[PDB]
Short mmCIF file of N, CA and C in Angstrom, two decimals:
data_model
loop_
_atom_site.label_atom_id
_atom_site.label_comp_id
_atom_site.label_asym_id
_atom_site.label_seq_id
_atom_site.Cartn_x
_atom_site.Cartn_y
_atom_site.Cartn_z
N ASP C 1 -27.39 13.02 2.20
CA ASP C 1 -26.96 11.64 1.94
C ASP C 1 -25.68 11.50 1.12
N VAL C 2 -25.10 10.31 1.19
CA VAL C 2 -23.90 9.97 0.45
C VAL C 2 -24.00 8.51 0.04
N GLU C 3 -23.29 8.12 -1.02
CA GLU C 3 -23.34 6.73 -1.48
C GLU C 3 -21.98 6.16 -1.89
N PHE C 4 -21.86 4.84 -1.87
CA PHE C 4 -20.61 4.17 -2.23
C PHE C 4 -20.81 2.83 -2.95
N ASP C 5 -19.76 2.35 -3.61
CA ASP C 5 -19.81 1.11 -4.38
C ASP C 5 -18.43 0.77 -4.92
N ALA C 6 -18.35 -0.37 -5.58
CA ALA C 6 -17.10 -0.84 -6.17
C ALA C 6 -17.45 -1.73 -7.35
N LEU C 7 -16.76 -1.53 -8.46
CA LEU C 7 -17.01 -2.33 -9.65
C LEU C 7 -16.50 -3.75 -9.46
N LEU C 8 -17.02 -4.65 -10.28
CA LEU C 8 -16.51 -6.01 -10.37
C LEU C 8 -16.14 -6.37 -11.79
N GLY C 9 -16.14 -5.40 -12.69
CA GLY C 9 -15.86 -5.67 -14.08
C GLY C 9 -14.52 -5.12 -14.52
N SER C 10 -14.00 -4.13 -13.80
CA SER C 10 -12.80 -3.43 -14.24
C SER C 10 -11.90 -3.04 -13.08
N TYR C 11 -10.62 -3.36 -13.22
CA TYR C 11 -9.61 -3.15 -12.20
C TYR C 11 -8.48 -2.30 -12.76
N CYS C 12 -7.86 -1.47 -11.92
CA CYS C 12 -6.88 -0.50 -12.38
C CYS C 12 -5.50 -1.12 -12.60
N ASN C 13 -4.63 -0.36 -13.26
CA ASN C 13 -3.19 -0.61 -13.31
C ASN C 13 -2.52 0.62 -12.71
N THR C 14 -2.24 0.56 -11.41
CA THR C 14 -1.64 1.70 -10.72
C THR C 14 -0.17 1.83 -11.06
N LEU C 15 0.62 0.80 -10.76
CA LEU C 15 2.06 0.85 -10.96
C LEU C 15 2.45 0.22 -12.29
N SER C 16 3.41 0.84 -12.95
CA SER C 16 4.08 0.28 -14.12
C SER C 16 5.54 0.12 -13.74
N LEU C 17 5.91 -1.08 -13.28
CA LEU C 17 7.24 -1.31 -12.73
C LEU C 17 8.23 -1.54 -13.87
N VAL C 18 9.11 -0.57 -14.09
CA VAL C 18 10.13 -0.66 -15.13
C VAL C 18 11.45 -0.97 -14.46
N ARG C 19 12.04 -2.10 -14.82
CA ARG C 19 13.39 -2.44 -14.38
C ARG C 19 14.38 -2.09 -15.47
N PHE C 20 15.55 -1.59 -15.05
CA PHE C 20 16.55 -1.17 -16.02
C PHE C 20 17.15 -2.35 -16.76
N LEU C 21 17.25 -3.51 -16.11
CA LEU C 21 17.74 -4.70 -16.77
C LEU C 21 16.71 -5.37 -17.65
N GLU C 22 15.49 -4.85 -17.71
CA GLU C 22 14.56 -5.27 -18.74
C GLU C 22 14.78 -4.53 -20.05
N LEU C 23 15.53 -3.44 -20.03
CA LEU C 23 15.69 -2.61 -21.22
C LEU C 23 16.79 -3.16 -22.11
N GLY C 24 16.75 -2.75 -23.38
CA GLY C 24 17.83 -3.06 -24.29
C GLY C 24 19.09 -2.25 -24.04
N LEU C 25 18.97 -1.13 -23.33
CA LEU C 25 20.11 -0.26 -23.12
C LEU C 25 21.15 -0.87 -22.19
N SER C 26 20.78 -1.85 -21.37
CA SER C 26 21.64 -2.38 -20.31
C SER C 26 22.85 -3.14 -20.83
N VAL C 27 23.01 -3.27 -22.14
CA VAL C 27 24.27 -3.73 -22.70
C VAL C 27 25.37 -2.73 -22.42
N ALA C 28 25.14 -1.45 -22.77
CA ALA C 28 26.14 -0.39 -22.75
C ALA C 28 26.67 -0.06 -21.36
N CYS C 29 26.12 -0.65 -20.31
CA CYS C 29 26.60 -0.47 -18.95
C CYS C 29 27.50 -1.62 -18.54
N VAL C 30 28.15 -1.45 -17.40
CA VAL C 30 28.59 -2.55 -16.54
C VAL C 30 28.04 -2.19 -15.17
N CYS C 31 26.87 -2.73 -14.84
CA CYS C 31 26.14 -2.34 -13.63
C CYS C 31 26.64 -3.14 -12.44
N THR C 32 27.72 -2.69 -11.83
CA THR C 32 28.19 -3.25 -10.58
C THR C 32 27.96 -2.24 -9.47
N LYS C 33 27.39 -2.70 -8.35
CA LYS C 33 26.95 -1.81 -7.29
C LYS C 33 27.91 -1.85 -6.11
N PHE C 34 28.12 -0.70 -5.52
CA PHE C 34 28.63 -0.65 -4.17
C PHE C 34 27.46 -0.60 -3.21
N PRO C 35 27.57 -1.21 -2.03
CA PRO C 35 26.78 -0.73 -0.90
C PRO C 35 27.53 0.31 -0.08
N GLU C 36 28.75 0.67 -0.48
CA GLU C 36 29.51 1.77 0.11
C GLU C 36 30.16 2.55 -1.04
N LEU C 37 29.52 3.65 -1.40
CA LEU C 37 30.14 4.59 -2.31
C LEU C 37 30.33 5.95 -1.67
N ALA C 38 29.41 6.36 -0.79
CA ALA C 38 29.47 7.68 -0.18
C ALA C 38 30.66 7.82 0.74
N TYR C 39 31.20 6.71 1.24
CA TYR C 39 32.40 6.74 2.06
C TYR C 39 33.67 6.93 1.25
N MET C 40 33.59 6.93 -0.07
CA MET C 40 34.78 6.88 -0.92
C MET C 40 35.11 8.26 -1.46
N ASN C 41 36.40 8.60 -1.41
CA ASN C 41 36.95 9.76 -2.11
C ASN C 41 37.24 9.37 -3.56
N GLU C 42 38.18 10.07 -4.20
CA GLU C 42 38.58 9.76 -5.57
C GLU C 42 39.00 8.31 -5.76
N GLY C 43 38.19 7.55 -6.49
CA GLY C 43 38.59 6.23 -6.93
C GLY C 43 39.13 6.31 -8.35
N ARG C 44 39.98 5.35 -8.70
CA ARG C 44 40.71 5.43 -9.96
C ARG C 44 40.60 4.12 -10.71
N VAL C 45 40.72 4.21 -12.03
CA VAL C 45 40.64 3.07 -12.94
C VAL C 45 41.84 3.11 -13.87
N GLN C 46 42.56 1.99 -13.98
CA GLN C 46 43.82 1.93 -14.70
C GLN C 46 43.65 1.35 -16.11
N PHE C 47 44.52 1.80 -17.01
CA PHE C 47 44.58 1.29 -18.37
C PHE C 47 46.03 1.14 -18.78
N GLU C 48 46.35 0.01 -19.41
CA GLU C 48 47.71 -0.24 -19.89
C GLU C 48 47.63 -0.50 -21.39
N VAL C 49 48.29 0.34 -22.17
CA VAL C 49 48.16 0.34 -23.62
C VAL C 49 49.52 0.03 -24.23
N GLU J 1 -39.34 17.02 46.44
CA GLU J 1 -40.01 15.73 46.32
C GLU J 1 -39.08 14.56 46.57
N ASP J 2 -37.79 14.71 46.31
CA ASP J 2 -36.89 13.62 46.57
C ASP J 2 -35.49 14.17 46.71
N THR J 3 -34.63 13.39 47.32
CA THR J 3 -33.24 13.75 47.53
C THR J 3 -32.29 12.91 46.70
N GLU J 4 -32.26 11.61 46.91
CA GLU J 4 -31.31 10.77 46.21
C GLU J 4 -31.88 10.43 44.85
N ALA J 5 -31.21 10.91 43.81
CA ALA J 5 -31.61 10.62 42.44
C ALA J 5 -30.72 9.55 41.84
N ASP J 6 -31.05 9.17 40.61
CA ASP J 6 -30.25 8.24 39.83
C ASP J 6 -29.56 8.99 38.71
N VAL J 7 -28.36 8.55 38.36
CA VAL J 7 -27.55 9.22 37.37
C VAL J 7 -26.93 8.16 36.47
N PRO J 8 -26.85 8.38 35.16
CA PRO J 8 -26.15 7.43 34.31
C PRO J 8 -24.66 7.46 34.59
N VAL J 9 -24.00 6.36 34.26
CA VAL J 9 -22.58 6.21 34.54
C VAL J 9 -21.75 6.20 33.26
N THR J 10 -21.93 5.19 32.42
CA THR J 10 -21.07 5.01 31.26
C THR J 10 -21.38 6.05 30.20
N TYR J 11 -20.33 6.53 29.54
CA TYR J 11 -20.49 7.51 28.48
C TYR J 11 -21.06 6.87 27.23
N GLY J 12 -21.69 7.70 26.41
CA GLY J 12 -22.17 7.23 25.14
C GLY J 12 -21.03 7.00 24.17
N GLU J 13 -21.24 6.03 23.29
CA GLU J 13 -20.19 5.70 22.34
C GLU J 13 -20.62 6.00 20.93
N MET J 14 -19.79 5.66 19.96
CA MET J 14 -20.08 5.93 18.56
C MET J 14 -19.78 4.71 17.71
N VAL J 15 -20.32 4.71 16.51
CA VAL J 15 -20.14 3.63 15.56
C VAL J 15 -19.84 4.24 14.20
N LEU J 16 -18.95 3.61 13.46
CA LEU J 16 -18.66 4.06 12.11
C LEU J 16 -19.76 3.60 11.16
N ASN J 17 -20.44 4.56 10.55
CA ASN J 17 -21.45 4.28 9.53
C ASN J 17 -20.92 4.85 8.23
N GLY J 18 -20.51 3.96 7.33
CA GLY J 18 -20.06 4.36 6.02
C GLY J 18 -18.61 4.81 6.01
N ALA J 19 -17.91 4.58 4.91
CA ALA J 19 -16.53 5.01 4.78
C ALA J 19 -16.16 5.01 3.31
N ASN J 20 -15.07 5.71 2.99
CA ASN J 20 -14.46 5.50 1.68
C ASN J 20 -13.99 4.06 1.58
N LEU J 21 -14.25 3.45 0.42
CA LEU J 21 -13.78 2.09 0.16
C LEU J 21 -12.46 2.19 -0.58
N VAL J 22 -11.38 1.81 0.09
CA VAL J 22 -10.05 1.92 -0.48
C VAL J 22 -9.30 0.65 -0.12
N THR J 23 -8.82 -0.06 -1.14
CA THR J 23 -8.05 -1.27 -0.94
C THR J 23 -6.95 -1.36 -1.98
N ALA J 24 -6.29 -2.51 -1.99
CA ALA J 24 -5.23 -2.79 -2.93
C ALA J 24 -4.98 -4.28 -2.91
N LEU J 25 -4.10 -4.71 -3.78
CA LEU J 25 -3.57 -6.06 -3.79
C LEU J 25 -2.27 -6.07 -4.57
N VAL J 26 -1.54 -7.15 -4.43
CA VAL J 26 -0.42 -7.45 -5.30
C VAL J 26 -0.78 -8.70 -6.08
N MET J 27 -1.01 -8.55 -7.38
CA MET J 27 -1.44 -9.65 -8.24
C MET J 27 -0.66 -10.94 -8.00
N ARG J 28 -4.98 -16.49 -7.78
CA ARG J 28 -5.57 -15.20 -7.48
C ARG J 28 -6.22 -14.59 -8.71
N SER J 29 -7.53 -14.81 -8.85
CA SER J 29 -8.26 -14.24 -9.97
C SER J 29 -8.49 -12.75 -9.75
N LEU J 30 -9.15 -12.14 -10.73
CA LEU J 30 -9.37 -10.71 -10.66
C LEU J 30 -10.56 -10.36 -9.78
N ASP J 31 -11.36 -11.34 -9.39
CA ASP J 31 -12.47 -11.08 -8.49
C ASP J 31 -12.05 -10.99 -7.04
N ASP J 32 -10.88 -11.50 -6.68
CA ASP J 32 -10.45 -11.43 -5.29
C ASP J 32 -10.37 -10.01 -4.77
N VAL J 33 -10.09 -9.04 -5.64
CA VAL J 33 -10.28 -7.65 -5.23
C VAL J 33 -11.65 -7.47 -4.61
N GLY J 34 -12.68 -8.00 -5.27
CA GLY J 34 -14.01 -7.90 -4.72
C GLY J 34 -14.15 -8.65 -3.41
N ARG J 35 -13.79 -9.93 -3.41
CA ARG J 35 -13.96 -10.72 -2.21
C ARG J 35 -13.23 -10.14 -1.02
N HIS J 36 -12.06 -9.54 -1.23
CA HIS J 36 -11.35 -8.94 -0.11
C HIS J 36 -12.10 -7.75 0.47
N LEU J 37 -12.92 -7.08 -0.33
CA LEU J 37 -13.72 -6.00 0.22
C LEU J 37 -14.69 -6.50 1.27
N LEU J 38 -15.56 -7.44 0.91
CA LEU J 38 -16.48 -8.01 1.87
C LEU J 38 -15.77 -8.45 3.13
N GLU J 39 -14.63 -9.10 2.98
CA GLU J 39 -13.74 -9.31 4.10
C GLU J 39 -13.57 -8.03 4.90
N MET J 40 -12.96 -7.01 4.31
CA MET J 40 -12.68 -5.79 5.04
C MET J 40 -13.94 -5.07 5.49
N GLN J 41 -15.10 -5.38 4.91
CA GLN J 41 -16.34 -4.89 5.52
C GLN J 41 -16.74 -5.72 6.71
N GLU J 42 -16.63 -7.04 6.60
CA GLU J 42 -17.11 -7.91 7.66
C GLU J 42 -16.43 -7.60 8.98
N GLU J 43 -15.24 -7.00 8.93
CA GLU J 43 -14.57 -6.59 10.15
C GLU J 43 -15.38 -5.57 10.92
N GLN J 44 -15.73 -4.45 10.29
CA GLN J 44 -16.38 -3.38 11.00
C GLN J 44 -17.65 -3.82 11.70
N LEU J 45 -18.39 -4.78 11.15
CA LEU J 45 -19.54 -5.29 11.89
C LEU J 45 -19.12 -5.88 13.22
#
């Protein structure tokens, strides 16, 4: 024989969804996304001082 | 004693008796997990 059942008093927490923009660290970034980065060779960023 | 006999035609079939109970939800009270089970059981009948 074998048996089965399911509780009605307690339910799990499977996933803990952590978003990066929920964190305090997301100040130190500038999170701008490409949907095309793999197509790109050397990109450059300019500074004038 | 005889020549022409009778033979069954249709094959025997099977029925699912018992299974692992596995479900999920995306959080609607907390009992709906339960109610959805009876749902997913009522299907197999």
